[PDB]
Design an enzyme around this catalytic site. Structure first.
Site, PDB file in Angstrom:
ATOM      1  N   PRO A 136       6.495 -65.612  -9.429  1.00  0.00           N
ATOM      2  CG  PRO A 136       8.720 -65.140  -9.933  1.00  0.00           C
ATOM      3  CD  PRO A 136       7.849 -65.721  -8.858  1.00  0.00           C
ATOM      4  CB  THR A 159       6.077 -64.205 -18.133  1.00  0.00           C
ATOM      5  OG1 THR A 159       7.277 -63.658 -17.571  1.00  0.00           O
ATOM      6  CG2 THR A 159       5.785 -63.544 -19.474  1.00  0.00           C
ATOM      7  CG  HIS A 185      14.182 -63.660 -13.441  1.00  0.00           C
ATOM      8  ND1 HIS A 185      14.788 -64.892 -13.335  1.00  0.00           N
ATOM      9  CD2 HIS A 185      13.196 -63.812 -14.328  1.00  0.00           C
ATOM     10  CE1 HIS A 185      14.177 -65.747 -14.137  1.00  0.00           C
ATOM     11  NE2 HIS A 185      13.208 -65.111 -14.748  1.00  0.00           N
ATOM     12  CG  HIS A 206      13.569 -69.786 -14.996  1.00  0.00           C
ATOM     13  ND1 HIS A 206      12.972 -68.965 -14.064  1.00  0.00           N
ATOM     14  CD2 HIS A 206      13.095 -71.032 -14.759  1.00  0.00           C
ATOM     15  CE1 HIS A 206      12.180 -69.685 -13.290  1.00  0.00           C
ATOM     16  NE2 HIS A 206      12.235 -70.943 -13.692  1.00  0.00           N
ATOM     17  CE1 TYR A 219      14.424 -65.852 -20.443  1.00  0.00           C
ATOM     18  CE2 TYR A 219      13.981 -66.652 -18.233  1.00  0.00           C
ATOM     19  CZ  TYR A 219      13.610 -66.521 -19.554  1.00  0.00           C
ATOM     20  OH  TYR A 219      12.420 -67.058 -19.988  1.00  0.00           O
ATOM     21  N   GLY A 230       3.314 -71.555  -8.604  1.00  0.00           N
ATOM     22  CA  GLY A 230       3.062 -70.868  -9.880  1.00  0.00           C
ATOM     23  C   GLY A 230       1.850 -71.389 -10.626  1.00  0.00           C
ATOM     24  NE  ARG A 231       4.038 -75.810 -13.539  1.00  0.00           N
ATOM     25  CZ  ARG A 231       4.671 -76.973 -13.449  1.00  0.00           C
ATOM     26  NH1 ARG A 231       4.696 -77.795 -14.481  1.00  0.00           N
ATOM     27  NH2 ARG A 231       5.283 -77.307 -12.328  1.00  0.00           N
TER      28      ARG A 231
HETATM   29  C1  FMN Z   1       3.555 -69.317 -17.731  1.00  0.00           C
HETATM   30  C2  FMN Z   1       4.750 -69.204 -16.831  1.00  0.00           C
HETATM   31  C3  FMN Z   1       5.373 -67.974 -16.658  1.00  0.00           C
HETATM   32  C4  FMN Z   1       6.480 -67.867 -15.823  1.00  0.00           C
HETATM   33  N1  FMN Z   1       7.102 -66.648 -15.655  1.00  0.00           N
HETATM   34  C5  FMN Z   1       8.193 -66.520 -14.825  1.00  0.00           C
HETATM   35  C6  FMN Z   1       8.809 -65.286 -14.661  1.00  0.00           C
HETATM   36  O1  FMN Z   1       8.377 -64.296 -15.249  1.00  0.00           O
HETATM   37  N2  FMN Z   1       9.907 -65.175 -13.834  1.00  0.00           N
HETATM   38  C7  FMN Z   1      10.391 -66.287 -13.176  1.00  0.00           C
HETATM   39  O2  FMN Z   1      11.371 -66.186 -12.438  1.00  0.00           O
HETATM   40  N3  FMN Z   1       9.781 -67.514 -13.341  1.00  0.00           N
HETATM   41  C8  FMN Z   1       8.683 -67.635 -14.165  1.00  0.00           C
HETATM   42  N4  FMN Z   1       8.069 -68.860 -14.330  1.00  0.00           N
HETATM   43  C9  FMN Z   1       8.622 -70.049 -13.607  1.00  0.00           C
HETATM   44  C10 FMN Z   1       7.841 -70.324 -12.331  1.00  0.00           C
HETATM   45  O3  FMN Z   1       8.474 -69.717 -11.229  1.00  0.00           O
HETATM   46  C11 FMN Z   1       7.766 -71.831 -12.136  1.00  0.00           C
HETATM   47  O4  FMN Z   1       6.482 -72.294 -12.494  1.00  0.00           O
HETATM   48  C12 FMN Z   1       8.070 -72.220 -10.699  1.00  0.00           C
HETATM   49  O5  FMN Z   1       9.458 -72.141 -10.467  1.00  0.00           O
HETATM   50  C13 FMN Z   1       7.579 -73.636 -10.445  1.00  0.00           C
HETATM   51  O6  FMN Z   1       6.352 -73.530  -9.767  1.00  0.00           O
HETATM   52  P1  FMN Z   1       5.174 -74.599  -9.985  1.00  0.00           P
HETATM   53  O7  FMN Z   1       5.689 -75.975  -9.638  1.00  0.00           O
HETATM   54  O8  FMN Z   1       4.043 -74.234  -9.059  1.00  0.00           O
HETATM   55  O9  FMN Z   1       4.701 -74.566 -11.419  1.00  0.00           O
HETATM   56  C14 FMN Z   1       6.967 -68.985 -15.159  1.00  0.00           C
HETATM   57  C15 FMN Z   1       6.341 -70.216 -15.338  1.00  0.00           C
HETATM   58  C16 FMN Z   1       5.234 -70.326 -16.170  1.00  0.00           C
HETATM   59  C17 FMN Z   1       4.567 -71.658 -16.351  1.00  0.00           C
END
Ligand code: FMN
Ligand code: WI6
Length: 359
Positions: A22, A24, A176, A179, A181, A317-318
């Site tokens: 997920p 945002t 959720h 993080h 919240y 994610g990223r």
């Molecule tokens: C731009 C952005 C938006 C994100 N939005 C959410 C979100 O809406 N809900 C959530 O649980 N985590 C959110 N995350 C956290 C992602 O889950 C996080 O990148 C992930 O735990 C780590 O994955 P990665 O190593 O591929 O970046 C967001 C992270 C980024 C960078």
């Protein structure tokens, strides 16, 4: 490649273990899922692939970010179904993440400039800044500690939003609770200073997430309910004196819910901060069911996790922002594209959203 072996996530037969985390993106203008959201998720959907929707509003008081989607109004339901249908046309499973920011909000995001609700009156300290609608950064205001009656109303907002997601055609929801919240404000002892039945011991600090999960389980079924936590992430002053103990405490309540309901949850999503770190496996060992690992995972690291039994699915994610075909890129070991932090939370429907090229 163990990342492309079939896994049964309850009644959902997935063709691979690559999961869209997920994220945002702030493209849902006026808290309405725009048509660009459909194009964004369709670029990322694959046959048998699991997608997790970005944080979605459960109430008019749940946002702390600009232009975030909601699921508490009929108009958002009829706009979500148009996007769920396009994703389902590609044969993908999609879950809508119910998001409540709690104290991580601002007067500009609250109706009539009200104060954000939280478990305590302490605000997020000044080393963290909230993104403003005009692109600047503001100051987190002083929240308002809610009573137990208001707690049950927020729980009902979770239950009502969970039913709207199934009405919109979602395969399920994810709670959720990470993080730093609203739910994370109750779990971590660094934020929860309450002296009632929702604070103090680990049992009291786990009551809110237990009531939230139990409500959405009894409404739409346990096998369509996901749970995301982050006991070790200290984002937005979300510190815990014993993160491993809190993680096992949350898992125990999740196992008790699965036993009293006679059904297994969809999964348990655990994300970790960017860095031994044996907390991920320890939480997987305690949980009975599907486990999704998250946090700084790559191709080799995700393959290593599934092959060693550390997790059933790996969410990215990223890399999923800049690689719409990240699922296929992992298969062929193709080079990945770089992402632009500047366009993470912009409002353009194409720039930094869907203009990332395929392989
Ligand atoms: C731009 C952005 C938006 C994100 N939005 C959410 C979100 O809406 N809900 C959530 O649980 N985590 C959110 N995350 C956290 C992602 O889950 C996080 O990148 C992930 O735990 C780590 O994955 P990665 O190593 O591929 O970046 C967001 C992270 C980024 C960078
Ligand atoms: N809704 C959410 O949970 C996400 C919203 C923002 C980004 N998520 C997390 O916030 C933290 C910082 O993200 P951001 O890109 O806003 O941070 P910088 O301003 O780059 O510092 C990370 O832990 C990231 O995984 C959480």
């Amino acid at each position: 490649n163990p990342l492309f072996s079939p896994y049964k996530m309850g009644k959902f037969n997935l063709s691979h273990r690559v999961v869209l985390a997920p994220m945002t993106r702030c493209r849902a203008l006026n808290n309405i899922p725009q048509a660009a959201l459909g194009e964004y998720y369709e670029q990322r959907a694959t046959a048998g692939g699991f997608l997790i929707t970005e944080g979605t509003m459960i109430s008019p008081t749940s946002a702390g970010f600009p232009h975030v989607p909601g699921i508490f109004t009929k108009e958002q339901v009829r706009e979500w179904k148009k996007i769920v249908d396009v994703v389902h046309a590609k044969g993908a499973v999609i879950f809508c993440q119910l998001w409540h920011v709690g104290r991580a909000s601002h007067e500009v995001y609250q109706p009539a400039g009200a104060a954000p609700i939280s478990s305590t009156e302490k605000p997020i300290s000044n080393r963290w800044r909230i993104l403003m609608p005009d692109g600047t950064h503001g100051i987190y205001p002083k929240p308002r500690a809610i009573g137990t009656y208001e707690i049950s109303q927020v729980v009902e907002d979770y239950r009502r939003s969970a039913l709207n997601a199934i009405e919109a055609g979602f395969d399920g929801i994810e709670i959720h609770g990470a993080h730093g919240y609203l739910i994370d404000q109750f779990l971590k002892d660094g934020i929860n200073d309450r002296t009632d039945e929702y604070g103090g011991s680990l049992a009291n600090r786990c009551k809110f997430i237990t009531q939230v999960v139990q409500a959405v389980v009894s409404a739409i079924g346990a096998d369509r309910v996901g749970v995301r936590v982050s006991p070790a992430i200290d984002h937005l002053d979300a510190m815990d004196s014993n993160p491993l103990s809190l993680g096992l405490a949350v898992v125990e309540r999740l196992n008790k819910i699965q036993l009293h309901s006679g059904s297994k949850l969809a999964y348990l999503h655990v994300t970790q901060p960017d860095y031994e770190a044996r907390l991920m496996r320890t939480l997987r060992n305690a949980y009975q069911g599907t486990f999704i690992c998250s946090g700084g995972y790559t191709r080799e690291l995700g393959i290593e996790a599934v092959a060693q039994g550390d997790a059933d699915l790996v969410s990215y994610g990223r890399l999923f922002i800049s690689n719409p075909d990240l699922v296929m890129r992992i298969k062929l070991n193709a080079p990945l594209n770089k992402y632009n932090r500047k366009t993470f939370y912009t409002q353009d429907p194409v720039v930094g959203y869907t203009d990332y090229p395929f392989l």
